[PDB]
Design a protein around this motif. Sequence first.
Motif, mmCIF file in Angstrom:
data_model
loop_
_atom_site.group_PDB
_atom_site.id
_atom_site.type_symbol
_atom_site.label_atom_id
_atom_site.label_comp_id
_atom_site.label_asym_id
_atom_site.label_seq_id
_atom_site.Cartn_x
_atom_site.Cartn_y
_atom_site.Cartn_z
ATOM 1 N N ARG A 71 16.410 -13.163 8.223
ATOM 2 C CA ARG A 71 15.809 -13.850 7.041
ATOM 3 C C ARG A 71 16.986 -14.221 5.835
ATOM 4 N N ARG A 72 17.978 -13.702 5.992
ATOM 5 C CA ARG A 72 19.018 -13.959 4.929
ATOM 6 C C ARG A 72 19.906 -15.149 5.422
ATOM 7 N N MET B 18 19.833 -1.114 5.767
ATOM 8 C CA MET B 18 18.488 -0.687 5.554
ATOM 9 C C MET B 18 18.441 0.957 5.751
ATOM 10 N N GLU C 233 16.758 -7.947 11.480
ATOM 11 C CA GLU C 233 15.885 -8.801 11.027
ATOM 12 C C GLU C 233 16.139 -9.196 9.366
ATOM 13 N N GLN D 197 3.238 2.111 4.378
ATOM 14 C CA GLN D 197 2.038 1.000 4.144
ATOM 15 C C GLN D 197 0.956 1.005 5.063
ATOM 16 N N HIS E 51 2.355 8.229 -7.271
ATOM 17 C CA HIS E 51 2.404 6.948 -6.944
ATOM 18 C C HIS E 51 1.256 6.324 -6.311
ATOM 19 N N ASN F 21 10.863 3.912 -4.827
ATOM 20 C CA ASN F 21 10.496 4.933 -5.774
ATOM 21 C C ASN F 21 11.434 6.362 -5.213
ATOM 22 N N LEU G 262 6.910 -7.485 -3.804
ATOM 23 C CA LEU G 262 7.622 -8.720 -4.184
ATOM 24 C C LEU G 262 6.809 -9.996 -3.950
ATOM 25 N N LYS G 263 5.910 -9.833 -3.427
ATOM 26 C CA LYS G 263 4.835 -11.060 -3.155
ATOM 27 C C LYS G 263 4.177 -11.250 -4.414
ATOM 28 N N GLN H 17 4.734 -3.438 -7.343
ATOM 29 C CA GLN H 17 6.114 -3.474 -7.198
ATOM 30 C C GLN H 17 6.396 -4.527 -5.650
ATOM 31 N N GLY I 232 2.102 0.483 -0.384
ATOM 32 C CA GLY I 232 0.680 -0.448 -0.741
ATOM 33 C C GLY I 232 -0.077 -0.199 0.476
ATOM 34 N N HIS I 233 -1.447 -0.563 0.102
ATOM 35 C CA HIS I 233 -2.553 -0.711 1.165
ATOM 36 C C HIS I 233 -2.808 0.651 1.530
ATOM 37 N N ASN J 123 20.641 -4.179 11.419
ATOM 38 C CA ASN J 123 19.417 -4.781 10.691
ATOM 39 C C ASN J 123 19.490 -6.098 11.128
ATOM 40 N N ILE K 71 18.966 -2.012 0.924
ATOM 41 C CA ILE K 71 17.815 -1.437 0.628
ATOM 42 C C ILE K 71 17.784 0.030 0.942
ATOM 43 N N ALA L 86 0.154 2.877 -5.030
ATOM 44 C CA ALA L 86 0.506 1.341 -5.357
ATOM 45 C C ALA L 86 -0.533 0.429 -5.067
ATOM 46 N N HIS L 87 -0.094 -0.772 -5.165
ATOM 47 C CA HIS L 87 -1.111 -1.830 -5.034
ATOM 48 C C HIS L 87 -2.019 -1.697 -3.762
HETATM 49 C C1 LIG Z 1 8.618 7.864 6.292
HETATM 50 C C2 LIG Z 1 7.868 7.050 5.336
HETATM 51 C C3 LIG Z 1 8.463 6.684 4.024
HETATM 52 C C4 LIG Z 1 7.360 5.910 3.279
HETATM 53 C C5 LIG Z 1 8.059 5.578 1.821
HETATM 54 C C6 LIG Z 1 7.130 4.657 0.977
HETATM 55 C C7 LIG Z 1 7.742 4.432 -0.359
HETATM 56 C C8 LIG Z 1 6.641 3.528 -1.088
HETATM 57 C C9 LIG Z 1 7.131 3.189 -2.492
HETATM 58 C C10 LIG Z 1 5.928 2.510 -3.281
HETATM 59 C C11 LIG Z 1 6.236 1.075 -3.225
HETATM 60 C C12 LIG Z 1 4.992 0.245 -3.652
HETATM 61 O O1 LIG Z 1 4.711 0.480 -4.800
HETATM 62 C C13 LIG Z 1 5.168 -1.184 -3.267
HETATM 63 C C14 LIG Z 1 4.926 -1.572 -1.804
HETATM 64 O O2 LIG Z 1 4.905 -0.920 -0.700
HETATM 65 O O3 LIG Z 1 5.298 -2.858 -1.623
HETATM 66 C C15 LIG Z 1 5.257 -3.393 -0.263
HETATM 67 C C16 LIG Z 1 4.065 -4.110 0.248
HETATM 68 O O4 LIG Z 1 3.095 -2.733 0.352
HETATM 69 C C17 LIG Z 1 4.269 -4.394 1.773
HETATM 70 C C18 LIG Z 1 2.867 -4.879 2.269
HETATM 71 O O5 LIG Z 1 2.296 -5.949 1.593
HETATM 72 O O6 LIG Z 1 5.200 -5.657 1.787
HETATM 73 C C19 LIG Z 1 6.311 -5.345 1.102
HETATM 74 O O7 LIG Z 1 6.978 -4.436 2.091
HETATM 75 P P1 LIG Z 1 7.723 -5.130 3.328
HETATM 76 O O8 LIG Z 1 8.726 -4.122 4.057
HETATM 77 O O9 LIG Z 1 6.578 -5.245 4.341
HETATM 78 O O10 LIG Z 1 8.419 -6.298 2.818
HETATM 79 P P2 LIG Z 1 9.191 -7.447 3.415
HETATM 80 O O11 LIG Z 1 8.641 -7.858 4.754
HETATM 81 O O12 LIG Z 1 9.457 -8.701 2.174
HETATM 82 O O13 LIG Z 1 10.650 -6.842 3.135
HETATM 83 C C20 LIG Z 1 11.082 -6.427 1.937
HETATM 84 C C21 LIG Z 1 12.804 -6.382 2.266
HETATM 85 O O14 LIG Z 1 13.455 -5.661 3.263
HETATM 86 C C22 LIG Z 1 14.120 -6.609 4.271
HETATM 87 N N1 LIG Z 1 13.957 -6.159 5.433
HETATM 88 C C23 LIG Z 1 12.943 -6.195 6.298
HETATM 89 C C24 LIG Z 1 12.827 -5.981 7.232
HETATM 90 C C25 LIG Z 1 13.638 -5.581 8.095
HETATM 91 O O15 LIG Z 1 13.777 -5.202 9.380
HETATM 92 N N2 LIG Z 1 15.104 -5.415 7.725
HETATM 93 C C26 LIG Z 1 15.174 -5.851 6.099
HETATM 94 O O16 LIG Z 1 16.387 -5.767 5.482
HETATM 95 C C27 LIG Z 1 13.810 -7.949 3.549
HETATM 96 O O17 LIG Z 1 14.965 -8.768 3.652
HETATM 97 C C28 LIG Z 1 13.344 -7.851 2.235
HETATM 98 O O18 LIG Z 1 14.277 -8.049 1.417
HETATM 99 C C29 LIG Z 1 6.436 -4.603 -0.319
HETATM 100 N N3 LIG Z 1 7.805 -4.157 -0.706
HETATM 101 C C30 LIG Z 1 8.458 -5.206 -1.223
HETATM 102 C C31 LIG Z 1 9.844 -4.471 -1.888
HETATM 103 O O19 LIG Z 1 8.072 -6.056 -1.638
#
Ligand SMILES: CCCCCCCCCCC[C@@H](O)CC(=O)O[C@H]1[C@H](O)[C@@H](CO)O[C@H](OP(=O)(O)OP(=O)(O)OC[C@H]2O[C@@H](n3ccc(=O)[nH]c3=O)[C@H](O)[C@@H]2O)[C@@H]1NC(C)=O
Lengths: 263, 263, 263
Positions: free
Chosen positions: B204-205, B170, B200, A161, A122, B137, A75-76, A73, A143-144, B198, B152, A124-125
């Motif tokens: 990015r947008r 967020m 960041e 993560q 779950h 999830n 997005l990268k 899941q 993830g990770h 939010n 999000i 994750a990757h």
């Molecule tokens: C109290 C603890 C609660 C924990 C809950 C955990 C739930 C996990 C559910 C399972 C998810 C798993 O299968 C996949 C996963 O974790 O993927 C991510 C991947 O592990 C990560 C590192 O490699 O990279 C990604 O997470 P990031 O948060 O680091 O991604 P990003 O930096 O691309 O930001 C994702 C979105 O958040 C938005 N964003 C980011 C930061 C911010 O300050 N505000 C904001 O809106 C940004 O615009 C973008 O649309 C990945 N996500 C996405 C959506 O791509």
Amino acid sequence: MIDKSAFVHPTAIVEEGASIGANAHIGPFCIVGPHVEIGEGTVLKSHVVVNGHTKIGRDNEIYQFASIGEVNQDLKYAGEPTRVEIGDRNRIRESVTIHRGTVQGGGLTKVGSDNLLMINAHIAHDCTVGNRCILANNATLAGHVSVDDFAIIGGMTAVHQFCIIGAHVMVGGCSGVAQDVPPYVIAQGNHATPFGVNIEGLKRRGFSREAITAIRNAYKLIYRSGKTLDEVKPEIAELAETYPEVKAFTDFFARSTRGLIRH
Amino acid sequence: MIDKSAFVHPTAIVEEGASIGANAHIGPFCIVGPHVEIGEGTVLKSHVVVNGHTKIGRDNEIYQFASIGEVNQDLKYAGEPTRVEIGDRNRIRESVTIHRGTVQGGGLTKVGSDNLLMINAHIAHDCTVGNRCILANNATLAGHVSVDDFAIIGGMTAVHQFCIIGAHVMVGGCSGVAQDVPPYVIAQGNHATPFGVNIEGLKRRGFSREAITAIRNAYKLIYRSGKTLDEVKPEIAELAETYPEVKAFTDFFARSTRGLIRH
Amino acid sequence: MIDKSAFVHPTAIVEEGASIGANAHIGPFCIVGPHVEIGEGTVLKSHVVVNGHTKIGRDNEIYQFASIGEVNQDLKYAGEPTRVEIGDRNRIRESVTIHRGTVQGGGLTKVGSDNLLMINAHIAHDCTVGNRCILANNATLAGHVSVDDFAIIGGMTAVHQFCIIGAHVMVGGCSGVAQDVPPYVIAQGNHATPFGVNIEGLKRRGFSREAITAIRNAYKLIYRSGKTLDEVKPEIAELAETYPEVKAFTDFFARSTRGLIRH
Ligand SMILES: CCCCCCCCCCC[C@@H](O)CC(=O)O[C@H]1[C@H](O)[C@@H](CO)O[C@H](OP(=O)(O)OP(=O)(O)OC[C@H]2O[C@@H](n3ccc(=O)[nH]c3=O)[C@H](O)[C@@H]2O)[C@@H]1NC(C)=O
Ligand SMILES: CCCCCCCCCCC[C@@H](O)CC(=O)O[C@H]1[C@H](O)[C@@H](CO)O[C@H](OP(=O)(O)OP(=O)(O)OC[C@H]2O[C@@H](n3ccc(=O)[nH]c3=O)[C@H](O)[C@@H]2O)[C@@H]1NC(C)=O
Ligand SMILES: CCCCCCCCCCC[C@@H](O)CC(=O)O[C@H]1[C@H](O)[C@@H](CO)O[C@H](OP(=O)(O)OP(=O)(O)OC[C@H]2O[C@@H](n3ccc(=O)[nH]c3=O)[C@H](O)[C@@H]2O)[C@@H]1NC(C)=O
Ligand SMILES: Cc1ccnc(-c2cc(C(=O)N3CCOC[C@H]3Cc3ccccc3)n[nH]2)c1
Ligand SMILES: Cc1ccnc(-c2cc(C(=O)N3CCOC[C@H]3Cc3ccccc3)n[nH]2)c1
Ligand SMILES: Cc1ccnc(-c2cc(C(=O)N3CCOC[C@H]3Cc3ccccc3)n[nH]2)c1
């Protein structure tokens, strides 16, 4: 190849190239992709999807509506041929998802042996789950994440993560883990904080009285002495010179990237 | 009608009257009811149930064990022919549920385009999800919830009925949202409370420095000035005269029915 | 035997020995084991697994991806032929799991009638769910839990093993229940604590003004008088001499093994 002693239900779809071991069982309405290897004696009950470059060991039990090897899941991720590895004698319950790695994260999601992954857990990757772990219903790893040997994660709990859940940890249910959990620790809350040593788990797993005492003293160095982590690291290494179980802390510190959970 | 270039797996059951677009793919063991429309290029991987009066756009990816268009869980629902609309290029992951509307709630559950709905996300009757949203999830919307563009919602988080999750919000994981979340806000907790803008995400947008500053100043009016919402509304409208991004607050206030989340 | 008026979809697999009642409906890709009894008019929509020694009553609606009668997740379970009983007119939604009992726990998981079990609700081994209950999405019962008549458990909420959720209780969403909840009580939080009497539920269910007042006075004895539970028990029994609804407390106290939730 499908071993002559494997059972493949007539309604299952096993794509040419899949490897199915001796006395394995592929139940009705399962789908198994061409890069899947299923080890000897492993059972897919029914309605299981296994795809991707995915290797599954022996004597596993995988229940209906599980998805193993699926596109992650992140997005990268862009469809690159990443991998899943699953060991032996795991119990992988209904609706569990285990997703393939990402190139960026090392290419591999790995699960060891003798784990119990309860309903809708779950993985994750790029996660690494060790041996003898328990993830209760709806436990969710971003993830990770690493879940080290014997660690247990309670129901409804999610892990941010890159966090490390150390060996023999017990994370309560209904918790959210945002930082790294040292080995042997009980953690609970939102966000999770430490509540001492998992004494009962160590007892049941054969740890000596001396080893548990040393682990309790290492816990006190980290959380009760009032010193910085940089000061206590050599003190914990010194303690490990006598009690080898304490080395788990040293090894964990070297992997920790998010800091430790704290009160 | 089934387009001649669509693929329908021999084990899938597509009921007469279903509309399947060009180059769509209906995988093994899917069920598609007679009032379903599936757009060009959309893929149902396998084991997907789509029923009800349900229109799905183009280039969607819907994973196994998802249920789209199903009878909702509102005890008031009595079988009336309500509807689901889903846009384009959504990624709808394993076990996601998207339920049909209720007569009482307007008759329509709607999802826009370019959304990512992660494993076991739940879109209840009469919800409206915008474009470019992420539900992690187990994120769970009660009936009548709005999730506005780019918002999000983190893992394990649930949203109480009728709440609005504003644009570019967020919401942290492990949270429970009981009131409305203004656009551009970070929210977290049980129940969720606001933690600033939010920044960041807006960065990015493509939001300008001036627009983000104005949004931060609008946030301060709401939560730091100490005035009532009725006093700040015209002050926010005044600010929007110069920075059009601030109008999102005005539009949100007019839809808000549960009050704002607060410290 | 399969009643001549039952419908069994050609893709469903009903094993010889299963009992299917009049006008029941077994949808596509369902699996029904040889020790299953499905009552008159009950519907399995599609993709449902029912196995074990499992008796299901009449007019139930069981949605896709549900698993009913399956091997439980208690590591103590070793394959013994334990049982599930489900009553009449239940709505059992997508991905619900209801697991068979354990010898150690009495051998039986039981669900009554007119319940609503929402998506991914989990009924563990040896649980007892009464009549007219609601479990919202992802509500999760550990083993041996009782959910008494009319009790409602909100979304994402989990209940620790052996706890009793008393009659007419309302447990909020996003909560974790670690102790017993007396009848008629509202509970919320992590861990859950009491927030007074479920007055609105009692009102809608026909309780008289006098009965609700007496229940409120019994609540005050328990939580506001400052006396011990041992002191208040005979005072509650005395009150029940006049208002029979108050006897529910006495009956609950005799079953309670984990103590009461408290502020
Ligand atoms: C109290 C603890 C609660 C924990 C809950 C955990 C739930 C996990 C559910 C399972 C998810 C798993 O299968 C996949 C996963 O974790 O993927 C991510 C991947 O592990 C990560 C590192 O490699 O990279 C990604 O997470 P990031 O948060 O680091 O991604 P990003 O930096 O691309 O930001 C994702 C979105 O958040 C938005 N964003 C980011 C930061 C911010 O300050 N505000 C904001 O809106 C940004 O615009 C973008 O649309 C990945 N996500 C996405 C959506 O791509
Ligand atoms: C911290 C935040 C946590 C949030 C967790 C959210 C989890 C959401 C899971 C997805 C559910 C979704 O798919 C369906 C949904 O939300 O439906 C409802 C529908 O959106 C709503 C409006 O139209 O109406 C209904 O909810 P209400 O709570 O308004 O219904 P109601 O007034 O009929 O009460 C339902 C039951 O609660 C009992 N009740 C009510 C009030 C009270 O004070 N005490 C009490 O016991 C009452 O007796 C009855 O049995 C609907 N429900 C039911 C069971 O019919
Ligand atoms: C805020 C509240 C959150 C509540 C969250 C609830 C989530 C529930 C999800 C559904 C689970 C349900 O389907 C099954 C269930 O509840 O089974 C158990 C069974 O109801 C119980 C009684 O009969 O017995 C078992 O639970 P226990 O915790 O009592 O088992 P145990 O004593 O064998 O300990 C299990 C593991 O925890 C380890 N442990 C135990 C205690 C301790 O202090 N530290 C520790 O590590 C121990 O080493 C072992 O590996 C059973 N478990 C297991 C894994 O066998
Ligand atoms: C007071 C309290 C506080 C926090 N969490 C709980 C809690 C978690 C669970 C739980 O998930 N399981 C899985 C099913 O086996 C039973 C139990 C084993 C376990 C216990 C503790 C941590 C992790 C696993 N049960 N209660 C209780
Ligand atoms: C310290 C903290 C506090 C509260 N919540 C979290 C939290 C939520 C998540 C999460 O659900 N996802 C989805 C998978 O993509 C990674 C991540 C993206 C995201 C981040 C923050 C909010 C919503 C989504 N990860 N950590 C962390
Ligand atoms: C402020 C607040 C605090 C805690 N929990 C909530 C909460 C729970 C739910 C929920 O699960 N459902 C199920 C779907 O029917 C709608 C609603 C019925 C219900 C209400 C309250 C308790 C249990 C069930 N909705 N909001 C709200």
